[PDB]
RNA sequence: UGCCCACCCGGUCAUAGUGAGCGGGUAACACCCGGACUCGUUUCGAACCCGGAAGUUAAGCCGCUCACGUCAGAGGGGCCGUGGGAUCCGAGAGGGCCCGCAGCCUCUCUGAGCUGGGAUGG
RNA sequence: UGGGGCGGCACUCCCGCGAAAAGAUAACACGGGAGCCCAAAGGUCGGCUCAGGCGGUACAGAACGCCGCCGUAGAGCGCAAGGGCAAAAGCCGGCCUGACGUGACCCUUCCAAGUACGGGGUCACGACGCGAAAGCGGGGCCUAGCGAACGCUCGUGCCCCCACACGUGGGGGCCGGGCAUGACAGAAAAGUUACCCCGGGGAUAACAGGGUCGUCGCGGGCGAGAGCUCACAUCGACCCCGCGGUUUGCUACAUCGAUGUCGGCUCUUCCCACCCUGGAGGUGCAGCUGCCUCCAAGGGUAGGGCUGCCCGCCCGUUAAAGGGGAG
RNA sequence: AGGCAGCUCGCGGGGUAGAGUGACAGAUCGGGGGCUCCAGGCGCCUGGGGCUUCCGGUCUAACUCCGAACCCACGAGCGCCGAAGAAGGGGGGAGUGGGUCACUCGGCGUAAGGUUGGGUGGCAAAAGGGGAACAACCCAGACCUGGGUUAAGGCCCCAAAGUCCCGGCUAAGUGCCAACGAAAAGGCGUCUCCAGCCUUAGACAGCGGGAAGGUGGGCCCAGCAGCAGCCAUCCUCUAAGGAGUGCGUAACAGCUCACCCGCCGAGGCUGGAGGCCCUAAAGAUUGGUCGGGGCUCAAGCCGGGCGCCGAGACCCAGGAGGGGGUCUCUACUAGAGAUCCUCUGGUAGGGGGGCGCUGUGAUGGGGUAGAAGGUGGGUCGUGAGAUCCACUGGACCCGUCACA
RNA sequence: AGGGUGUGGCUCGAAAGAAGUGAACCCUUCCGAAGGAAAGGGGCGCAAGCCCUUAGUACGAGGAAGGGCGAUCGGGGUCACG
C-alpha cells in the first residue's frame, strides 16, 4: 500500500450523471486532461470507486512524482496568494511556504502532501497507443497501479 | 390463437385462484403414466434450454404423442414410467372485448384494457428445467429417445435430452 | 385509482411484529430510562401499544429530546429541511448508539 | 472464613423450552394438620383467607440422563441473486466478461443457562 | 373520458396489491368497503380461558349436564380488508357515566415545499367514577362513518340603539351548538336543430398515408390416423415455428385559412403465392382422362342475365376464361 | 461564520430479488401401510369412495419460519465552497402548469415510433466531429485569430490515413449493418474440440466359399415349408453358423438377416456439442444492391497485433469583454487611466450600457447661395451608426449639455 | 441552385485610403512557445514493427535586424476550378 496516489480525468464533462459530476469537483476535476495528487486513504477510494469511469488513477513513485511537480505554468503553480504561479525554481518556494506547508526550503524538500488543479495534455503517441476506449472497463479507465507512471510519462 | 402471443413472459404470475373467478379447466390431467416403482435401468431426462411459458394445449398433445409411440412399441403396464413434472399454474388472459365489447361503441378500444382468463401455462423461469422423463430399462433406450424427440415437437422451448 | 390516505396505510408489514416479540409490552428495562434534554433517541413504533402513535413516515428517524409534557417527550426531527416536533409515548422510543 | 446452593425481589426472555425416568433435604422452600375468629365458597375450609404444627422427600422446587424443540460452529448435498461498465454476444428472450457485495434450505457431527440486589445452609 | 356519445364513477372517504426492503409515485389497473350501529357493544375493578380432540357417565345422539387428559390461539373482539391481543384487548360478574365544563399544542389529510374541513394524539385548571393502591378513564383494540360565507334558530353572561336626556316594548352585538350543499375545498337550472351561425382545433374523429399483425391470406415441422397390407401416390387430427401487408381492428404521428369521399368506363404499367400456354419428375401412371411436386411472369385470361354496387349466384362458350399493387 | 451536492467509519431502520412449503393461507402430482362401506368373482381376491399415517414432486401480484445486493436517518472524520465571489432575514419583476426520445426497473396490452409510473441523459434552450443523409445515438460544451496533440470513428477508389502483419474459416457475391432486415426444422457440406466401443492374437468396407443340416419340426391348415391367428427352443460341432431378417410367394423356392474360412494389410465405428455456410427465405407503390465503384489465401467473417489520420475537446501564442480586489486625477447624475485574479452556448424571462428620428431652453458653439435631399465611391466603429470625396441640386442646417 | 472562402484570368482605379520621409517582391543572419523527426550505428521479434544513440538536434507559430530592386498595393466588377 503506496501512499500517494495520482489521479487524472479521462473524459470531458458534457453529459455526465449528476451524482458523478459533483463527485469530481470535490475531487478538483472540473474537465480534462487535469490531474491531482491525494493520499491513499479508505475516505478517498470510495471516491474514486464511484468516478471510475471517468477517471484513472495508480500509485505514484520518484519518477511519476517529480514530474508532475515540473509540469506547472503561468496558471498552474500551487496557491500562492492564488495566481498559480509556475514554481520553475525555489524562489516562490523561499517566501510562500512560511504559512501552512513546513520543511519546504528548497525545491528537493517539496515531496510530502498536496497540490492543485494540474493541467494536462492528451498523451502523445495516441491515447490508443495499444487501446481503442477509454470508455472499457479497466481497457483504459480505473485503477491500473504502478502503470500510472509512464502514462503520465506520455502527458 | 398462435402461440407467439403467449411464449413469453408479460406481467408477474397471474395464479391466486380466490381472485380470479371463471378459470377453464386445464387440457392435462394425468401426469403419471405407466408402471412407477417397476426395475429400470435407464432414467433419461427432457430438459429445457430457455425460459418462457408453455401452454396447456401445447402440454397434452406433448404427452399423448409420447404415450402412444412408447404403448406402441411393447405395451402400457410394462418397463415404461412416463411422467411430466410441471403443472400449468399461471392464468393466461385475452382482451376478448376486442371480438365483442370492441364494436358496440362499448368499451371498445383499449379503454379498460384488463382481459379476461383463457387457458394456463407453465412458467420456466430458470435454465435447465426438467419437463418430463421416461424409464425404461437396457432393451428399449433406442425407442425412448424417439419418444422424447417426437414429444419435443409439439413444445414452444428449445430442449435437450439426457441419459443416466 | 389513487391510493387512501389514512394514517394506517402501506403499513402491512413495517407494523408486523416477528414472532418472539409478540405479546403485551415485553421489554420494560428501556423504561426505566428517563430521557434529558439533549438526548438522542429513535423514533420505532411499536405495534402492539396503540396509545401516542406516531405515524409510518418517521419510523427509524433519529430525534433530540427538547422537553416533556405528561409521561410524553417532544422529540425535534428532521424530514427534509424541516424541523417537526413529536409528543411519543416511551413505548415508541429506543436510546441511540 | 470462604466461595456456590437454595429462598425473596428481579434483568435477559427457548443456547434458557416440553415430556419421561432418577438423585437430593433433620435448617430453608413445600406438600401437610385444623377451622373458634378477619374473610370465603350462585354447593363444597377444594380454592381464597385465618390458626397451626404430627408426618414426608412421594409431588412442586433444584440437579443428572435420554428423547424430541431451539440457537450456533463444522461438514456433505439442492437452489441462486445483485450495484457500476462497454458502437460486448444474440432476431429476441436471455447470456458471457471486467470492477464491487452476498444469501436461503436440507442432512451429519459437537456443545448449550447466564446474570444484579438481600435473609437461611455447606 | 385511448374522438364524442351510451355506459361506468377510477368525482368525498377507508383497507390490501400495483410500489422496485427509507420517503414520494400514474392507469376507464386488480380484490373490496363507508355515508352507520351501541346506554352498552362505553369507564373501572375482580375472577376465568378459547376453537378442536380423547377417556368415563340413563334417557345422551358427532353435537345438553357431570368427572378427568391435551390444546400458541387453529376462537372471539358490531360491520370491508389489513394489523394487534392469553393471570388479556376475549368470556362472566360488581359498582358507575371521563360519550365531562373551559383553554392550548402537535401529527395526518397535505414528503422535501403553500393548503379548508374531518380524524387522532399529549396536556393544564375544575369536578367525578372505579379500585387497598400505584393508577386508569374527555367513547367504541387500531386504520372509514363526513361539510364554507350569508340567513334562521337554540344555549350562555354581559355590551349597544343616533341631530338632547330618561323609561317601557322591540331590535342588534360578542362566544358555543343545530338546520346543507354526495358534482362531497359548496350555482338555484330540460331538450332540440339535416334551417342552423361564429371563434377555433390536425391538442380530436370519418377517407387517405405511417407504426403493429390479434383478425385475414399463405408457408414449414410433427405425424393421430385412412388408403385391402403401407404414415408421407393422395389426404392429413392435436400441437409447434414463421411470412405478407391485398381484409378487419388497435394507436392518434401528418393534413381542420380543404390532398374532391363509393362504383363504373377509358388508358398505362408492375408483383408472383402459376389459372392456361413451355420444360422435368412421381403415381394406387396400360391407353384417354386425372391427382401431386419443382422451374418459369415471354404471351393470354373473353361475352351475357340479376343487383347502384363489391362480393356472389346463374346462361352459352373457351386452351384458360388466376389472384393482387400503383394516395 | 459556517454549509453539504460526494465518500469512509460507527450506530440504527427496512421485508424487495432469491429461497421455502411439516412455519400460517390457498393451490397441486404420484406411491406404501392401517380402518370402513359398496359392487363383482370363487372366508379370500379385484375395483370405487371416505379418514389417518409415512415417503417423494409442482407453485403464489393481493403466502412468509427466513432473507441479499441496495437505499435511507444521526454523530465524527475526509473532501470541496466561504470573510473578493458570504448560512439566516427583508424586498422588486417574471416565465412555466401540451413535453418528447434513448438506456435501464416495472403495470396494462398479441403488439406498437401505444399508453401509464421510478432512475439517469440528450433535445427543447446546443454548435462542431462521427452515424450515407438524421431534433433524440456516440465524442464533445463554440469569446475572436493562428500553431499542435488526441476522442468517437476510420485507413483499396470516391475521401485525410494500411492494397498493414500472424493463425484459421466461407464459395454463397453469403457478406462489406452498434442502434438496422429472420425463426422452428434438415445437411458427416466442410472445419474443431468430449465420450464410448472395436483394432497387427490382423478392425471397418469389400470380394469367393462355407453361405447350412432333424425338419420344410411344428399348433391351425390342400399349404404360409422364419416373416397368415399364440409360442418354445434342442447338437453330427470346431479354423464354421441362430430353431433364422426384409423381400415375397395360393404355396414354394430363392436373394438377403447371423456366424467362420481365404485374401488384404492401417486404423475404424456410433453418440454429444460448437464455427461458418446451404435449404427453409415469396411483392409490387415504377428501375440494380453494402451509400456507390467494386471486392474471392478478400476490400468478407472469427481469435490477436502494429502504425497512422482525424473536432471548436485538451495544450500554446496574440487579441477582446464581463465581474472582483488594490490605486491615481477631474466643480463628478460622469469621464480618463495603471495594476493583479478569475470567467466566455443559449429560448421564455430578469438586469447593465449605447446608436438613431422630430421639437423645446441654453451654448465654448457654429455653417450657408457653395444648405437640406439624391447617386456612386473612400475611411472609422463588434455593432446599431458616424464622417468625408465627385457629380446632381437651389435655401436652409448642424456639434455639445438638458428635456419631451 | 448562392452566399462565404482559396488559387488564377480579364477589366476600373481623379478624389476621399497607404506610399519616393519608399508600395510590392526577393536574399541573409538572429531569437523562438506548445510540439518534434529521419538517414547512420547497435539490439529484440516469424512479421507489421519496437527499444538505446542520433537528440529535444533539424525543424516549428510568431518576432527582430540588416542587404537588393525599385512603383505599385489595399479596394470595386465579372469569369473558371477546388
Redesign the pocket.
Known sequence: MNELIGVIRI?????????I???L????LK????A?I??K???????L??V??YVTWGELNDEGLRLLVSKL????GKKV?????KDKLNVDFQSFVESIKDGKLRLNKLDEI?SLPI????????????????????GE???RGDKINELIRRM | ?????????????????????GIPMP?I????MGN??GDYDYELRLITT???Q??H??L???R??AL??LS?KLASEQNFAL?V???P??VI????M??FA??????????????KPIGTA?????????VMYVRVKKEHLEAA??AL??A?????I?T??E?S | ????????????????????????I?????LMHDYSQGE?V?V?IN????????????????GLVVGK????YEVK??????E????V?PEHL?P??
Open positions: 473524459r470531458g464533462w458534457a453529459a455526465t450523471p449528476w451524482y459530476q459533483d463527485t469537483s470535490m475531487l478538483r474537465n480534462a486532461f487535469n491531482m491525494y493520499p486513504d479508505s475516505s478517498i477510494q470510495g471516491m470507486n464511484l471510475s469511469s505554468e503561468i496558471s498552474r496568494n492564488e495566481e498559480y504561479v498536496f493541467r494536462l495534455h492528451p498523451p502523445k503517441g495516441g491515447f490508443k497507443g495499444k487501446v481503442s476506449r477509454p470508455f472499457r472497463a479497466g479507465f480505473g485503477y | 390463437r398462435p402461440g407467439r402471443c403467449y411464449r413469453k413472459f408479460s406481467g408477474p404470475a397471474y395464479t391466486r385462484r380466490e381472485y380470479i373467478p387440457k390431467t394425468k401426469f403419471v412407477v416403482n430457455e425460459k418462457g408453455i401452454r394445449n401445447a397434452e398433445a406433448a399423448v404423442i402412444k409411440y406402441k411422467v413434472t410441471k403443472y399454474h399461471h388472459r385475452e382482451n376478448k376486442m371480438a370492441g364494436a358496440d361503441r362499448l368499451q371498445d378500444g383499449m379503454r379498460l384494457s384488463f382481459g407453465a412458467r420456466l423461469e430458470k435454465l435447465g428445467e426438467l429417445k424417439e424427440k417426437i419435443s415437437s409439439k413444445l414452444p428449445r435437450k435430452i441419459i | 385509482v389513487a391510493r387512501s390516505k389514512g394514517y394506517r396505510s402501506k403499513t402491512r408489514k413495517l407494523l408486523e411484529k416477528k414472532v418472539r416479540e409478540k405479546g403485551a415485553p421489554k420494560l428495562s428501556l438522542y429513535v420505532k405495534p402492539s401499544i396503540h396509545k401516542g402513535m406516531p405515524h409510518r413516515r418517521y419510523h427509524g428517524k433519529v409534557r405528561g409521561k410524553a426531527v428532521n424530514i427534509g429541511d424541516k417537526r416536533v413529536l409528543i409515548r429506543i441511540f448508539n
